Write an enzyme that holds these catalytic residues in place. Structure first.
Site, PDB file in Angstrom:
ATOM      1  N   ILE A 185      -7.728   1.727   1.615  1.00  8.82           N
ATOM      2  CA  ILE A 185      -7.551   1.072   2.931  1.00  8.82           C
ATOM      3  C   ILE A 185      -8.480   1.727   3.942  1.00  8.82           C
ATOM      4  CG2 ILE A 185      -5.969   0.740   4.812  1.00  8.82           C
ATOM      5  CD1 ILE A 185      -3.760   0.546   2.590  1.00  8.82           C
ATOM      6  N   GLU A 239      -0.811   2.187  -3.566  1.00  5.63           N
ATOM      7  CA  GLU A 239      -0.298   3.063  -4.653  1.00  5.63           C
ATOM      8  C   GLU A 239       0.546   2.211  -5.594  1.00  5.63           C
ATOM      9  OE1 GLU A 239      -1.742   5.676  -5.012  1.00  5.63           O
ATOM     10  OE2 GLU A 239      -1.693   7.079  -3.369  1.00  5.63           O
ATOM     11  N   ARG A 265      -1.716   0.528  -8.002  1.00  4.70           N
ATOM     12  CA  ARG A 265      -2.242   1.462  -9.023  1.00  4.70           C
ATOM     13  C   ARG A 265      -1.227   1.757 -10.119  1.00  4.70           C
ATOM     14  NH1 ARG A 265      -4.304   4.677  -3.885  1.00  4.70           N
ATOM     15  NH2 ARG A 265      -6.503   4.101  -3.873  1.00  4.70           N
TER      16      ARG A 265
HETATM   17  N1  LIG Z   1      -6.574   5.169   2.894  1.00  4.81           N
HETATM   18  C1  LIG Z   1      -6.087   5.185   1.602  1.00  4.81           C
HETATM   19  N2  LIG Z   1      -6.076   4.020   0.970  1.00  4.81           N
HETATM   20  C2  LIG Z   1      -5.605   3.983  -0.322  1.00  4.81           C
HETATM   21  N3  LIG Z   1      -5.160   5.066  -0.986  1.00  4.81           N
HETATM   22  C3  LIG Z   1      -5.168   6.241  -0.306  1.00  4.81           C
HETATM   23  N4  LIG Z   1      -4.740   7.463  -0.726  1.00  4.81           N
HETATM   24  C4  LIG Z   1      -4.896   8.299   0.300  1.00  4.81           C
HETATM   25  N5  LIG Z   1      -5.433   7.634   1.355  1.00  4.81           N
HETATM   26  C5  LIG Z   1      -5.595   6.322   0.980  1.00  4.81           C
END
Ligand SMILES: Nc1ncnc2[nH]cnc12
Ligand SMILES: *[C@@H]1O[C@H](CO)[C@@H](O)[C@H](O)[C@H]1NC(C)=O
Length: 245
Positions: free
Chosen positions: A71, A160, A163
């Site tokens: 992001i 997350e 993922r």
């Molecule tokens: N900005 C972000 N976007 C996606 N995963 C992340 N993990 C840590 N920061 C993140």
């Protein structure tokens, strides 16, 4: 683009949204039946737009880099917001160009800097669908301190969960009641790059990790992952960060 509406959301509709977010990311091949994200995408095609709507139907649009599910920034009404880091500055050349102004948040988008800005580690911030409603609400109008915690919620409930199937399931459990992340949730979030790398190296090593990865499992116990027959590889991880990144 992908969209999610909190009004009327349930575990099924969230699960389908996360399936749809994963499917919006391009790949040329799978490794052990997991999509391998691309090494690079030039120009505006690098960014997916994710439209999120709170219970009351107000919305932000979130820009996500499709090579790493990162992001970069978001649009709320007439104002764009970007993390203070070069990848997000680059994204701002391509997305939300019609915003009346662009704010650079006073932190990068990594967990270390967001947790310092929020004043709390991930372990202490409840997540869930109500928390995502609150996070969208918070991000509609600038507040950099409140925004950092909102962004930690946003990252964990979207990127997350995309993922890791386990993290998707943890957010489904929190559809109507927020709860701080499980020990395994934090472990997986911290390990995505490492796991990705080892699964790609395993393809030339008979499914064996060159370097075993330590995780916390769903029971809160430490486990060593050594090869692709582990449930983290066969069931849990859903996207691989390309080793070129
Ligand atoms: N900005 C972000 N976007 C996606 N995963 C992340 N993990 C840590 N920061 C993140
Ligand atoms: C391979 O991983 C499986 C599943 O976790 C495990 O049972 C097995 O012991 C591993 N093999 C080796 C040689 O480490």
């Amino acid at each position: 683009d992908v969209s999610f509406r909190l009004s009327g959301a349930d575990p099924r509709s969230y699960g389908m949204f996360i399936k749809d977010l994963r499917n919006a990311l391009p790949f040329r091949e799978k490794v052990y039946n997991i999509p391998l994200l691309l090494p690079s995408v030039s120009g505006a095609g690098r960014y997916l737009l994710m439209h999120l709507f709170n219970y009351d139907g107000k919305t932000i649009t979130v820009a996500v880099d499709v090579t790493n599910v990162y992001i970069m920034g978001y649009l709320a009404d007439t104002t764009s917001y970007f993390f203070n880091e070069p990848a997000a500055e680059l994204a701002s050349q391509y997305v939300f160009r019609d915003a009346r102004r662009k704010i650079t948040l006073p932190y990068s988008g990594n967990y270390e800097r967001l947790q310092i800005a929020a004043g709390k580690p991930r372990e202490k911030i409840p997540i869930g669908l109500p928390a995502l409603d609150s996070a969208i609400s918070t991000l509609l109008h600038y507040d950099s301190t409140a925004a950092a915690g909102a962004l930690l919620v946003l990252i964990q409930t979207t990127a997350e969960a995309a993922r890791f199937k386990y993290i998707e399931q943890q957010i489904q459990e929190r559809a109507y009641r927020d709860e701080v992340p499980s020990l395994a949730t934090i472990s997986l979030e911290n390990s995505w790059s490492g796991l990705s790398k080892q699964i790609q190296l395993a393809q030339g090593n008979n499914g064996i990790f060159r370097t075993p990865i330590v995780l916390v499992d769903n029971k809160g116990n430490r486990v060593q992952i050594t090869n692709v027959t582990s449930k983290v590889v066969t069931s849990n991880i859903q996207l691989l960060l390309n080793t070129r990144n």
